[PDB]
Design an enzyme around this catalytic site. Structure first.
Site, PDB file in Angstrom:
ATOM      1  N   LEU A  54      33.780  43.508  90.096  1.00 12.44           N
ATOM      2  CA  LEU A  54      34.795  44.956  91.430  1.00 12.44           C
ATOM      3  C   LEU A  54      34.757  43.719  92.435  1.00 12.44           C
ATOM      4  CD1 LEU A  54      32.266  47.309  89.381  1.00 12.44           C
ATOM      5  CD2 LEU A  54      34.196  47.226  89.519  1.00 12.44           C
ATOM      6  N   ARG A 111      42.487  32.109  93.430  1.00  9.05           N
ATOM      7  CA  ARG A 111      42.550  31.926  91.777  1.00  9.05           C
ATOM      8  C   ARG A 111      43.077  32.212  90.509  1.00  9.05           C
ATOM      9  NH1 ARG A 111      37.077  29.084  93.639  1.00  9.05           N
ATOM     10  NH2 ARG A 111      37.990  27.966  95.122  1.00  9.05           N
ATOM     11  N   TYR A 121      40.357  35.193  95.717  1.00  9.01           N
ATOM     12  CA  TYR A 121      40.466  35.687  94.020  1.00  9.01           C
ATOM     13  C   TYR A 121      41.629  35.958  93.477  1.00  9.01           C
ATOM     14  CZ  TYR A 121      35.012  36.040  94.020  1.00  9.01           C
ATOM     15  OH  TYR A 121      33.944  36.227  93.221  1.00  9.01           O
TER      16      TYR A 121
HETATM   17  C1  LIG Z   1      31.273  34.790 100.418  1.00  5.75           C
HETATM   18  C2  LIG Z   1      29.924  33.637  99.510  1.00  5.75           C
HETATM   19  C3  LIG Z   1      30.079  33.750  99.006  1.00  5.75           C
HETATM   20  C4  LIG Z   1      30.315  31.977  99.772  1.00  5.75           C
HETATM   21  O1  LIG Z   1      29.668  31.230  99.655  1.00  5.75           O
HETATM   22  P1  LIG Z   1      29.834  29.511  99.848  1.00  5.75           P
HETATM   23  O2  LIG Z   1      29.887  29.846 101.184  1.00  5.75           O
HETATM   24  O3  LIG Z   1      28.938  28.216  99.621  1.00  5.75           O
HETATM   25  O4  LIG Z   1      30.912  29.326  99.818  1.00  5.75           O
HETATM   26  P2  LIG Z   1      32.664  27.394 100.054  1.00  5.75           P
HETATM   27  O5  LIG Z   1      31.169  26.737 100.523  1.00  5.75           O
HETATM   28  O6  LIG Z   1      32.914  27.403  98.281  1.00  5.75           O
HETATM   29  O7  LIG Z   1      33.459  28.667 100.718  1.00  5.75           O
HETATM   30  C5  LIG Z   1      34.932  27.621 100.735  1.00  5.75           C
HETATM   31  C6  LIG Z   1      35.200  28.898 100.774  1.00  5.75           C
HETATM   32  O8  LIG Z   1      36.583  29.937 100.482  1.00  5.75           O
HETATM   33  C7  LIG Z   1      35.637  31.123 100.472  1.00  5.75           C
HETATM   34  N1  LIG Z   1      35.199  31.845  99.848  1.00  5.75           N
HETATM   35  C8  LIG Z   1      34.431  31.349  98.379  1.00  5.75           C
HETATM   36  N2  LIG Z   1      34.348  32.209  97.509  1.00  5.75           N
HETATM   37  C9  LIG Z   1      34.443  33.410  98.009  1.00  5.75           C
HETATM   38  C10 LIG Z   1      33.943  35.099  98.119  1.00  5.75           C
HETATM   39  N3  LIG Z   1      33.725  35.479  97.114  1.00  5.75           N
HETATM   40  N4  LIG Z   1      35.320  35.459  98.670  1.00  5.75           N
HETATM   41  C11 LIG Z   1      35.633  35.493  99.816  1.00  5.75           C
HETATM   42  N5  LIG Z   1      35.932  34.526 100.471  1.00  5.75           N
HETATM   43  C12 LIG Z   1      35.649  32.890  99.305  1.00  5.75           C
HETATM   44  C13 LIG Z   1      34.241  31.219 102.075  1.00  5.75           C
HETATM   45  O9  LIG Z   1      34.814  31.655 102.724  1.00  5.75           O
HETATM   46  C14 LIG Z   1      35.290  29.450 102.563  1.00  5.75           C
HETATM   47  O10 LIG Z   1      35.900  29.311 103.088  1.00  5.75           O
HETATM   48  P3  LIG Z   1      36.415  28.107 104.315  1.00  5.75           P
HETATM   49  O11 LIG Z   1      37.786  29.023 105.302  1.00  5.75           O
HETATM   50  O12 LIG Z   1      36.838  27.368 103.679  1.00  5.75           O
HETATM   51  O13 LIG Z   1      35.377  28.874 105.315  1.00  5.75           O
HETATM   52  C15 LIG Z   1      29.011  33.621 100.864  1.00  5.75           C
HETATM   53  O14 LIG Z   1      29.400  33.022 102.316  1.00  5.75           O
HETATM   54  C16 LIG Z   1      27.928  34.884 100.530  1.00  5.75           C
HETATM   55  O15 LIG Z   1      27.233  34.748 100.313  1.00  5.75           O
HETATM   56  N6  LIG Z   1      28.619  35.624 101.314  1.00  5.75           N
HETATM   57  C17 LIG Z   1      28.088  37.491 101.844  1.00  5.75           C
HETATM   58  C18 LIG Z   1      28.923  38.360 100.891  1.00  5.75           C
HETATM   59  C19 LIG Z   1      30.297  38.324 100.222  1.00  5.75           C
HETATM   60  O16 LIG Z   1      30.780  38.591 101.541  1.00  5.75           O
HETATM   61  N7  LIG Z   1      31.024  38.007  99.913  1.00  5.75           N
HETATM   62  C20 LIG Z   1      30.654  37.627  98.295  1.00  5.75           C
HETATM   63  C21 LIG Z   1      31.796  38.306  97.499  1.00  5.75           C
HETATM   64  S1  LIG Z   1      32.155  37.625  95.948  1.00  5.75           S
HETATM   65  C22 LIG Z   1      31.390  39.115  94.928  1.00  5.75           C
HETATM   66  C23 LIG Z   1      32.099  39.748  93.601  1.00  5.75           C
HETATM   67  O17 LIG Z   1      32.677  39.082  92.939  1.00  5.75           O
HETATM   68  N8  LIG Z   1      31.840  39.955  93.010  1.00  5.75           N
HETATM   69  C24 LIG Z   1      30.153  41.173  93.612  1.00  5.75           C
HETATM   70  C25 LIG Z   1      31.100  42.556  93.571  1.00  5.75           C
HETATM   71  C26 LIG Z   1      30.141  43.783  92.751  1.00  5.75           C
HETATM   72  N9  LIG Z   1      29.498  44.716  93.616  1.00  5.75           N
HETATM   73  C27 LIG Z   1      29.875  46.523  92.365  1.00  5.75           C
HETATM   74  C28 LIG Z   1      28.966  47.049  93.157  1.00  5.75           C
HETATM   75  C29 LIG Z   1      27.971  47.687  92.381  1.00  5.75           C
HETATM   76  C30 LIG Z   1      26.021  47.116  92.819  1.00  5.75           C
HETATM   77  N10 LIG Z   1      25.730  48.128  93.603  1.00  5.75           N
HETATM   78  C31 LIG Z   1      25.380  48.868  93.433  1.00  5.75           C
HETATM   79  C32 LIG Z   1      24.024  49.494  94.645  1.00  5.75           C
HETATM   80  C33 LIG Z   1      24.629  50.277  95.652  1.00  5.75           C
HETATM   81  N11 LIG Z   1      24.547  49.513  97.251  1.00  5.75           N
END
Ligand SMILES: CC(C)(COP(=O)(O)OP(=O)(O)OC[C@H]1O[C@@H](n2cnc3c(N)ncnc32)[C@H](O)[C@@H]1OP(=O)(O)O)[C@@H](O)C(=O)NCCC(=O)NCCSCC(=O)NCCCNCCCCNCCCN
Ligand SMILES: CC(C)(COP(=O)(O)OP(=O)(O)OC[C@H]1O[C@@H](n2cnc3c(N)ncnc32)[C@H](O)[C@@H]1OP(=O)(O)O)[C@@H](O)C(=O)NCCC(=O)NCCSCC(=O)NCCCNCCCCNCCCN
Lengths: 169, 169
Positions: free
Chosen positions: A127, A142, A139
């Site tokens: 989700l 990708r 996504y």
């Molecule tokens: C986003 C990160 C995970 C990224 O990890 P890193 O920093 O290690 O990434 P890299 O060093 O490899 O970077 C590569 C580049 O691509 C982008 N980059 C890399 N990865 C990403 C992602 N994932 N997204 C966006 N951009 C990204 C990123 O911006 C970079 O770009 P640059 O411009 O180069 O700097 C992190 O910042 C983090 O933990 N953030 C906090 C969480 C967040 O905000 N989003 C998480 C969404 S993924 C979640 C997901 O898929 N499904 C979960 C949803 C399901 N829920 C249902 C709820 C039900 C349950 N609940 C009930 C209780 C009620 N309460």
């Protein structure tokens, strides 16, 4: 940026709960984590595992302000489709703030793909919140499809309260 | 109208595939059921079960035109939430046309609710098509929430081809 992505062990459950609670404090809705460390052990490291976690681990040099080696995680499990069989389901992942931007999230994504090839899954489902256009576009770049927008699927839930009724109605 | 709802056994998999193919024939979207009877057996009746089915069985009295006793099914599995733990997930259910309207569907719903209490699930999740206003209202009248409307969740999919790239890059 030295880190390793490995499977979680039972010794990692305290770290996973800590990160779940940091994810909870992070994400905008205000639900509280009812889950305990024991639940996590029972449900993941007992008999039949109801979830699997991947864990991001750093060496002593890069340990947190509180001495932790675990800085990220992914939670997944296996689901089923009547048309095409076994699927990989991505529930959540999170990387701690001061550790973002070093390829952890990407590397986590790589290891999930390997789980899906290994386990013979035809798709990975998950989700995304509609308001989160940066993550949506991420996504789609990708190869992801939005099945809610294509086929019109909405997520429903019936809570314990009403299931109680129905189990006795 | 006599019928029983029961757990599926390995001897039911042919009927389940048959009803799955009838469900596909029913659905408006056109997708090929790629699953075989062997898939259903390995995946459901092998070592780790990836799905569980409930089955609607009628006595010899009202067997089908081709002589089958199985007239409906539900497919479900268990999923996981980091806030609250184990959930029941309802994938699908279906009743044959000539057997609709005698309480099978509701009785299937009833038995799924029992599954949720026996396995200590906090809620039951499923998908409904936004266009299907009869189903939506039916489920609301039973206390269902629309989590896509409330929280903005959209279902995403990255299929085999793109997972292949990511797993190797
Ligand atoms: C986003 C990160 C995970 C990224 O990890 P890193 O920093 O290690 O990434 P890299 O060093 O490899 O970077 C590569 C580049 O691509 C982008 N980059 C890399 N990865 C990403 C992602 N994932 N997204 C966006 N951009 C990204 C990123 O911006 C970079 O770009 P640059 O411009 O180069 O700097 C992190 O910042 C983090 O933990 N953030 C906090 C969480 C967040 O905000 N989003 C998480 C969404 S993924 C979640 C997901 O898929 N499904 C979960 C949803 C399901 N829920 C249902 C709820 C039900 C349950 N609940 C009930 C209780 C009620 N309460
Ligand atoms: C709907 C039935 C199950 C009903 O069962 P019964 O006939 O036994 O019902 P009862 O006798 O107990 O009760 C009678 C009254 O209750 C109402 N009654 C009872 N139930 C209902 C429902 N559900 N809706 C409306 N009315 C109902 C009904 O209208 C009556 O009303 P009265 O006014 O009292 O007379 C059945 O007709 C049937 O199987 N129909 C075919 C399937 C169908 O149309 N809907 C199934 C929705 S549940 C599905 C669900 O939850 N998630 C599936 C989504 C997951 N997809 C993900 C995609 C993945 C696959 N990707 C591959 C590519 C695809 N190509």
């Amino acid at each position: 940026a030295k880190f390793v992505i490995r499977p979680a062990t039972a010794a990692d459950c305290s770290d996973i709960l800590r990160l779940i609670k940091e994810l909870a404090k992070y994400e905008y809705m205000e639900e509280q984590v009812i889950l305990t460390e024991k639940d996590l052990l029972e449900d993941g490291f007992g008999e039949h595992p109801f979830y699997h976690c991947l864990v991001a681990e750093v060496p002593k040099e890069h340990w947190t302000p509180e001495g932790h080696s675990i800085v990220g995680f992914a939670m997944y499990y296996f689901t089923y489709d009547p048309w095409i069989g076994k699927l990989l389901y991505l529930e959540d992942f999170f990387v701690m703030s001061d550790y973002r931007g070093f390829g952890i999230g990407s590397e986590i994504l790589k290891n999930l793909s390997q789980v899906a090839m290994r386990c013979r899954c035809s798709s990975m489902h998950f989700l995304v919140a509609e308001w989160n256009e940066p993550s949506i576009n991420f996504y789609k770049r990708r190869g992801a499809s939005d099945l809610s927008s294509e086929e019109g699927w909405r997520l429903f839930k019936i809570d314990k309260e009403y299931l109680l009724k129905m189990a006795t109605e």
